[PDB]
Symmetry: C2
Subunit: 218 residues, 2 copies
């Protein structure tokens, strides 16, 4: 008989994750995930030629990083120069039967690896859960906003880089409309309105058609 | 000394897991998990001295394994003899940036390892994805009931086998009335396991506990 059975030794009381760009908690191990378990996800740099990243370990159901429990922090340095998004940093959360959490960060290109060990009531747990359930909508809105923001900032930077290396190819009126749309996006990014930013991204995208060809023709 | 960001925004459309004992889907990677990601969990054999396990890979939200889509299957052979629950088999689901799912299984005692690669589009299409979601919300209560029933059944099966082993395990320092009453409770439990009622089975487990004091004592002395 070829059957396999689930070992259930324990469950996690709260979500476990790391802080990512925009000050948001990104979950590696969700609440009520069976223990022992090993989850890992791949992340990247937020800047061109960024040489190091900070892993800030968080516990809780809130979306804003400061609104959760801070478990620990460590750095991964020696990341080889590359555009943002290029380096691949694998972050692993490993929970054993002892309930002891191990967090590691590993660069796949350079092989460099760093890690920490994190040790460790019901009233505080339930307070965190209730507090999360009370603010749930604001938290969701914040999360979506952050994602939209990072996307927009990316769009802004990339479009400006291609505009600078475009000339003198890129024509007059196109460059004017593009720069105006870029300014518009930049102002939208400071706001709390997700829809306005989506709108500005779309607007910048619709005056940007020629840029693609120009960069492609070399 | 700067910010770290999510590499891809892509997420898994449906849960990914394997079939476990009782024909139930156990999820390794939940629906809407960001990619690339790697999840691993430890499982074991369901029978004594079992030499192999079948890893049956499933995609979907249903609790009955067959109600989900089968992605692929492979066997992990060469498992050294041991009681059920003893071998430690680590199953890993790894989705890369390309969205390709790699499933591996490794027995820790024997070091044996087997794996398969599952391509995208060997899963459900967008329409099928939405259909699966609807079907799961429609059947959620029944699926949950089936799942709980399966867990209860497996606990009961364990108790049955273990108690019968204790009788087998010496096991006749056990007197007249006791062996009979225990075997009767075991038969009652075993027939209850055939039923669809979780509470009835739990009841038979407790009742079996009420006839087992002498077994407990004898075994306690023999081990100690
Ligand atoms: Ca099975
Ligand atoms: Ca994960
Ligand atoms: Ca950060």
């Amino acid at each position: 008989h070829h059957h396999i059975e689930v070992l259930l030794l324990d469950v996690t009381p709260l979500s476990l994750g790391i802080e990512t760009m925009g000050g948001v908690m990104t979950t590696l191990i969700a609440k009520n995930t069976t223990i022992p378990t090993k989850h890992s996800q791949v992340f990247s740099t937020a800047e061109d030629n960024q040489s190091a990243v900070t892993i800030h370990v968080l516990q809780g159901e809130r979306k804003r990083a400061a609104d959760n429990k801070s478990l620990g922090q460590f750095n991964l340095d020696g990341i080889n120069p590359a555009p943002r998004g290029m380096p691949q940093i694998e972050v692993t959360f490993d929970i054993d039967a002892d309930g002891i959490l191990h967090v590691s960060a590993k660069d796949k290109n350079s092989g460099k690896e760093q890690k920490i060990t994190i040790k460790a009531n019901e009233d505080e747990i339930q307070k965190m859960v209730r507090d999360a359930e009370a603010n749930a909508e604001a938290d969701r809105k914040f999360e979506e906003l952050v994602q939209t923001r990072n996307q927009g900032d990316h769009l802004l930077h990339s479009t400006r880089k291609q505009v600078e290396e475009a000339g003198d190819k890129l024509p007059a009126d196109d460059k004017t409309a593009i720069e105006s749309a870029l300014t518009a996006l930049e102002t939208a990014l400071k706001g709390e309105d997700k829809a306005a930013i989506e709108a500005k991204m779309q607007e910048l995208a619709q005056v940007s058609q020629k840029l693609m060809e120009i960069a492609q023709q070399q």
